[PDB]
Predict the structure of DDap: (ACE)IWGDSGKLI(DNP)TTA ANALOGUE OF HIV GP41.
Amino acid sequence: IWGDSGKLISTTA
């Protein structure tokens, strides 16, 4: 459903 963040590290919910 979420996948990843998209900035630097992504695991940032």
Summary: The CA atoms of residues 2 and 8 lie 16 Å apart. The two ends are 12 Å apart (CA to CA).
